[PDB]
């Protein structure tokens, strides 16, 4: 139609709209036209939709796939990181089919050092399965990671870091195994060197070391103090681009449903910023290694509320007063504002995504006062509760900050309605050809759209927010 070409020509045509028509249009000429406009969007804008594109190349008809293939091949040549995350996502979502063949080609045509490093970190986690205690696992984790330094520096990077870099040293001592489970996750710290563009800068120079435990001491300390001991005892800590990263390696849990939640989190974060609503959420990057392994971006200066309640032996309100300050100091009033804004943010994230399995082991607390929800495993298809302890930090029911917590949820829901399509398509595309527990009964997307309550007036949204808060109690 003349109008469609006009809309595509019209600036209103953004990268989100190109995805929707590519997923919905049955006209190949329209699919092929959009497959050529991908080259004209920004590099960063299209990458956010890479799980949607590669899932469309694998599970849609050959017309949709062969319209996406030229942009993927072009991007795989520009960025080796793009090549890596492509092959990882290709083999993750196809149980066979065309994607295996594409993945083999990407692997065949400098990726071997990176693939060897990732294959090692997953081999370490699997080997720790025979050791029953969490301290016996940590004893082998640290000595095995001390062997990766024999292969460093190298053409090896961590995709969960927003910048291009090379891994130069790993401090084995600071790594910790989380629990005594067979598929137990573990945390690792990695020293990297940032560059302007990874595919142009050569491997950094190697600097040896010589122990005596001056920096090996692994103790519970602030992140600012954990870096100081590491940078001091490191041979690369004197460099300007020296940066310390933190990654959680889960070698036996599937993180694809955690990647879907990362996108929905980052889109809502984009929607509220656009609508100038001061909500707050924390999206942590997910590196899907395979259909049952991956990595988690470790947020620093953040600890489970279950651990804050155990370590401090206090209540939540008592901890903020001790950690931040009195009712009349600026330090507490700031941490309370960050608590309220982050709560109202994650309240909507929970309601819209139906995030079940909500206890204080899956809720964090950063140093500024925000909260962070993790383990998006029971979503769509235990529910979120604003417990008696949470209402206290906001000054009680009749207080001002609780009414502000109420209005923040309303403003953020009005905002999410103005951009419902950008969020639903993230979930709707991934339902294609997936066997994840979130998609079941074919009502997953019908009920997801129904929860936005597009038909309701703003007056009826107010009463809807009142009811939701009462249930959360």
């Amino acid at each position: 139609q003349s109008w469609l070409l006009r809309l595509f020509e019209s600036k209103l045509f953004d990268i989100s709209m190109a995805i929707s028509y590519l997923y919905n249009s049955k006209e190949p000429g329209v699919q092929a036209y959009i497959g050529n406009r991908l080259f004209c969007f920004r590099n960063e804008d299209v990458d956010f939709y890479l799980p949607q594109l590669l899932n469309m190349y694998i599970h849609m008809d050959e017309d949709v796939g062969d319209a996406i293939k030229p942009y993927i091949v072009h991007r795989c040549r520009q960025s080796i990181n793009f090549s890596l995350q492509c092959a990882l996502l290709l083999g993750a979502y196809s149980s066979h089919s065309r994607g295996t063949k594409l993945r083999k080609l990407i692997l065949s045509d400098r990726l071997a050092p990176e693939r060897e490093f990732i294959k090692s970190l997953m081999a370490i986690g699997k080997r720790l399965a025979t050791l029953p205690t969490k301290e016996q696992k940590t004893q082998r984790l640290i000595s095995e990671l001390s062997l990766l330094n024999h292969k460093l520096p190298a053409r090896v990077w961590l995709p969960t870091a927003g910048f291009d870099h090379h891994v130069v040293r790993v401090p084995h001592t600071q790594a910790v195994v989380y629990n005594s489970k067979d598929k137990a996750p573990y945390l690792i710290y990695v020293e990297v060197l940032e560059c302007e563009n990874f595919d142009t800068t050569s491997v950094p120079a190697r600097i040896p070391e010589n122990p005596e435990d001056p920096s090996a001491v692994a103790l519970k300390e602030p992140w600012q103090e954990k870096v100081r001991r590491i940078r001091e005892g490191s041979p690369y800590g004197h460099l300007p681009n020296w940066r310390l990263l933190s990654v959680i390696v889960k070698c036996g849990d599937d993180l694809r449903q955690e990647l879907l939640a990362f996108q929905v989190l980052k889109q809502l974060q984009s929607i509220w910023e656009q609508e100038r609503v001061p909500l707050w959420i924390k999206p942590y990057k997910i590196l899907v290694i395979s259909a049952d392994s991956g990595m988690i971006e470790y947020v620093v200066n953040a600890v489970s509320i279950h651990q804050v309640k155990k370590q401090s032996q206090l209540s939540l309100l008592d901890y903020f007063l001790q950690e931040h300050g009195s009712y009349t100091t600026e330090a507490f009033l700031s941490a309370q504002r960050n608590f309220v804004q982050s709560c109202a943010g994650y309240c909507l994230v929970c309601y819209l995504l139906q995030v079940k399995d909500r206890h204080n082991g899956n809720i964090l607390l950063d140093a500024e006062g925000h909260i962070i929800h993790i383990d998006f495993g029971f979503i769509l298809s235990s529910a979120f509760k604003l417990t008696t302890e949470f209402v206290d930090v906001m000054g009680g029911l009749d207080g001002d900050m609780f009414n502000y917590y109420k209005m923040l949820m309303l403003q953020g829901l009005i905002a999410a309605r103005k951009h419902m399509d950008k969020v639903v398509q993230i979930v709707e595309i991934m339902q294609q050809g997936s066997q994840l527990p979130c998609f079941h009964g074919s009502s997953t997307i019908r009920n997801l759209k129904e929860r936005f309550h597009m038909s309701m007036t703003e007056e009826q949204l107010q009463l809807l927010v009142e009811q939701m808060v009462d249930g959360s109690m």
Binding site: L4, G29, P70
Partner: protein, 171 residues
């Protein structure tokens, strides 16, 4: 009109036959497209050497409508074999389209190998030089057009109609 030319359009389904035939007669391009059933007819007049020529252009869909598409090849003074630039299969079957045209058209018919969809710069699968070399080796006219961008669309018909007029000069 001084002359009444009869031109046909051949090519694999989905290469821009209907939109090239559209964009020439009237400046209309549609992405949402219906496949041509049987044949499509559009007309336009041109002036070559000051003689007003009328062109009956038919978008022949040929084995599917063999009884009808063959009746439009008979007496056809010209033909435009168009292929998709962003689809290498439609370029491999060009020889097959030339074979069916030669079987049912006159030897004097001038055939122009057109490479549609030149706006799809990045998805290009057929090189420009391989088509221009394939034209000289087979005695055709190579020229890549864009019915969407409306570039070379009016200049491709006027380089085969002027050729259809210059070859009728031997009278």
């Amino acid at each position: 009109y001084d002359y009444l030319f009869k031109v046909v359009l051949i090519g694999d389904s989905g290469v821009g036959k209907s939109n090239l035939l559209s964009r020439f007669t009237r400046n209309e391009f549609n992405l949402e497209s219906k496949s041509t059933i049987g044949v499509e007819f559009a007309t336009r007049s041109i002036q070559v050497d000051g003689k007003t020529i009328k062109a009956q252009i038919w978008d022949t869909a040929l084995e599917r409508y063999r009884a009808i598409t063959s009746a439009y090849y008979r007496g056809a003074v010209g033909a435009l074999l168009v292929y998709d630039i962003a689809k290498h299969l439609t370029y491999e079957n060009v020889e097959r389209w030339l074979k069916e045209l030669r079987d049912h058209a006159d030897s004097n018919i001038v055939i122009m190998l057109v490479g549609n969809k030149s706006d799809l710069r990045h998805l290009r699968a057929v090189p420009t030089d391989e088509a221009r070399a394939f034209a000289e080796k087979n005695g055709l006219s190579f020229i890549e057009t864009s019915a969407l961008d409306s570039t070379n669309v009016e200049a491709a018909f006027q380089t085969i109609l002027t050729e259809i007029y210059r070859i009728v000069s031997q009278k």
